[model samples]
Target: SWQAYTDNLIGTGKVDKAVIYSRAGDAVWATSGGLSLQPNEIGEIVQGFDNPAGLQSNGLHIQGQKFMLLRADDRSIYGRHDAEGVVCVRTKQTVIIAHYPPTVQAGEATKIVEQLADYLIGVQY
Candidate 1:
């Protein structure tokens, strides 16, 4: 599943890269960002998953928090949340943004963002 998602993201030429935020701050994903999709579009994709887990009410923070968290077997995470829906960080470039709900850990969300960032930065054209 992670491979597929990674492939999908990498396939998109607009996605620039993936940035995953971990403990030390933001980390780079080896193969991140390819073809970019909007966050809502990504959410739509995530919603189609068989069964996803809900992080937490607090974790569900955004303009209009109302979506589920889907985790791939490879530890890759995606989310579907809010009425505003997922945000397309870079629609022109096709860069999309997804967020993980805040977990029990203090900087889990930040770490995840860093991870996504790392992924994006690490990928080669």
Candidate 2:
């Protein structure tokens, strides 16, 4: 359940969005113009996993499923499920907006979320 939630948070939202704009066919791609960050840089900064490289090369195989990617201005990344399919990840700085309703355990999620918010607030450059 945690993995599914985590996957929905990042994979569907940010990763899929990147895939769409590049129109690089069922694969993720960098935005032609925007506040573009080299995918590798994003990968390097974020902890865990090798998916970052998949992001850099316009990779769009989510859990082995095909998808797309998009870039947003507000820095908020998220996923949407509707007539347009499911999932979108958004970020405003370090905060990741997830698609599914938050299933954070009251005790753990609260502390974790708060810590993340604080980190975002205090981040410099």
Each model's total of backbone clashes = 32, 26
Q: How does model 1 fare in lDDT?
A: 0.34
| Candidate 1 lDDT by residue in tens digits, 75-124 | 23344443222222221112324433232231344344435445644562
Residue 123, candidate 2: how far off, in angstroms? 11
Please write out the lDDT profile of model 2 over residues 1-125, one tens digit for every residue. Answer: 22343443234332222211211122232231122334443332232122334343444333233233332223222122222222222223332322222342223322333343355446630
Q: Per-prediction TM-score, please?
A: 0.25, 0.23
User: Model 2: C-alpha RMSD to truth?
Assistant: 13.5
Question: Which portions of model 1 miss their true places by more than 4 Å?
Answer: 1-63, 66-96
Error (Å) of candidate 2 at residue 11 is 20
